[PDB]
Amino acid sequence: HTVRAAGAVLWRDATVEVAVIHRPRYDDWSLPKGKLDQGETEPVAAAREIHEETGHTAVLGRRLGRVTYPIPQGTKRVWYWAAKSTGGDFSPNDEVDKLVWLPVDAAMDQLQYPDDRKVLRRFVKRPVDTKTVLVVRHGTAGRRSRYKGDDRKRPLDKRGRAQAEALVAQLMAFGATTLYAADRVRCHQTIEPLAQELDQLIHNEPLLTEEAYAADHKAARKRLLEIAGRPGNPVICTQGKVIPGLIEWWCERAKVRPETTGNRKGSTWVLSLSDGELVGADYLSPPDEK
Ligand SMILES: Nc1nc2c(ncn2[C@@H]2O[C@H](COP(=O)(O)OP(=O)(O)O)[C@@H](O)[C@H]2O)c(=O)[nH]1
Ligand SMILES: [Mg+2]
């Protein structure tokens, strides 16, 4: 069998130091990680494990790949994120009796596992103090053909409503702060729950609809870059025939290679930016898939 897990390179600005945790059961030094709970997405599990094992709150940034290791029951697969500490503090807990904050070179020597050193090597390979643009395809909204009335007003269905609710924890894991939605009800409804959680208004985006994008893709590219340049971590909820065009264009321009890809309803692209440059493009499956 295969056990899905998530973890992080937790880091702080002491000047970058990384957290290394000691687990006395095994007597080893590692990166924080743990298994996904039922219904949990990898990013939400990573943030929870950071809090349970280190005592810190954090904001996830760039994805740092996956590590597979054998366990008695079969295989454990762990997706890792860079995670900047935002608060909290370490007190000993069930799994961890010691935490040390080390510069990356010293942390590399402290780690027990070759695959944790590979993760830390990926961490240092690019900027970590990043901002994040979260591009979300709206949730499930039934069929255009079975809908009577303006297609623009077609609402989320029950499943899509559930996806919208499940996206709050996932987008908050990345420190979402500002909200944008293509001019379609189904796009606004996907981030409505997040708008209530943040108490933030959704800015309507006429240029990022399928129809607008098809007629004027250059206006849409320029609008994406403008949103990306504003302070904060914006969420942009749009449509299936818009997102691949925008993501592939930006990744080809920046020479960024996405490790995963897809375009499902409810999916999220985490775009990591440093000083205006794209440095990561991480596709997350819908919260009720995978
Ligand atoms: N190769 C490898 N083994 C690990 C790692 N973490 C834990 N283990 C080993 O895998 C087994 C299960 O540990 P773990 O995955 O932490 O699960 P838990 O301790 O039951 O929560 C134990 O033998 C661990 O020593 C790792 O990063 N790599
Ligand atoms: Mg283990």
Task: DSSP for 119-167, please give it.
Answer: HHHHHHHS--S-EEEEEEE------STT--S-GGGPPP-HHHHHHHHHH
- Cα 89 → chain centroid: 23
Q: What is the rounded distance in angstroms from the CA atom of residue 49 to the CA atom of residue 55?
A: 9
Cα-to-centroid distance, 23 and ligand 2 (Å)? 10
The answer to whether residues 259 and 284 touch, using CB atoms and an 8 Å cutoff, is no
Which residues have C-beta atoms less than 6 Å from ligand 1? 26, 30, 69, 71, 76, 113, 115-116
Q: Any idea how long the chain is?
A: 290
For 54, how many CA atoms within 13 A lie in the half-sphere containing its CB? 34
Task: Tell me the structure's resolution in angstroms, rounded to a single decimal.
Answer: 1.5
Cα-to-centroid distance, 35 and ligand 2 (Å)? 9
**Same domain assignment for residues 171 and 87:** no
Bridge partner residues of 30 (DSSP) = 21
**Same domain assignment for residues 118 and 150:** no
**Same domain assignment for residues 236 and 159:** yes
**Same domain assignment for residues 162 and 41:** no
**Same domain assignment for residues 69 and 174:** no
Please say which residue of 81, 104, 128 terminates a domain. Answer: 128
Residue to substitute in 21, 71, 73, 111 for testing ligand 1 pocket (most ligand atoms within 8 angstroms of CB): 71
Distances in Å between the Cα of 152 and the Cα atoms of 51, 147, 182, 197 are 41, 10, 10, 25
Residue nearest to atom 24 of ligand 1 (CA): 26
For 8, how many CA atoms within 13 A lie in the half-sphere containing its CB? 32
**Same domain assignment for residues 143 and 259:** yes
Total domain count for the chain? Answer: 2
Please say which residue of 109, 128, 147 terminates a domain. Answer: 128
Rounded to a whole number, what is the largest CA-CA distance in the chain? 64
259 annotated as ligand-binding: no
Cα-to-centroid distance, 105 and ligand 2 (Å)? 23
Residue 13 belongs to what domain range? Answer: 1-128
Q: What is the rounded distance in angstroms from the CA atom of residue 212 to the CA atom of residue 58?
A: 37
Please say which residue of 108, 128, 148 terminates a domain. Answer: 128
**Same domain assignment for residues 252 and 160:** yes
**Same domain assignment for residues 114 and 223:** no
**Same domain assignment for residues 215 and 246:** yes
The answer to whether residues 21 and 99 touch, using CB atoms and an 8 Å cutoff, is yes
**Same domain assignment for residues 141 and 53:** no
Alpha helices by DSSP H, listed for the chain, are 42-54, 104-110, 114-125, 158-173, 185-198, 210-215, 217-229, 243-254
34 annotated as ligand-binding: yes
206 annotated as ligand-binding: no
**Same domain assignment for residues 152 and 211:** yes
Q: What are phi and psi of 45, to 5 degrees?
A: -60, -45
Distances in Å between the Cα of 24 and the Cα atoms of 92, 102, 240 are 11, 19, 48
Please name the method used to determine this structure. Answer: X-ray
**Same domain assignment for residues 58 and 16:** yes
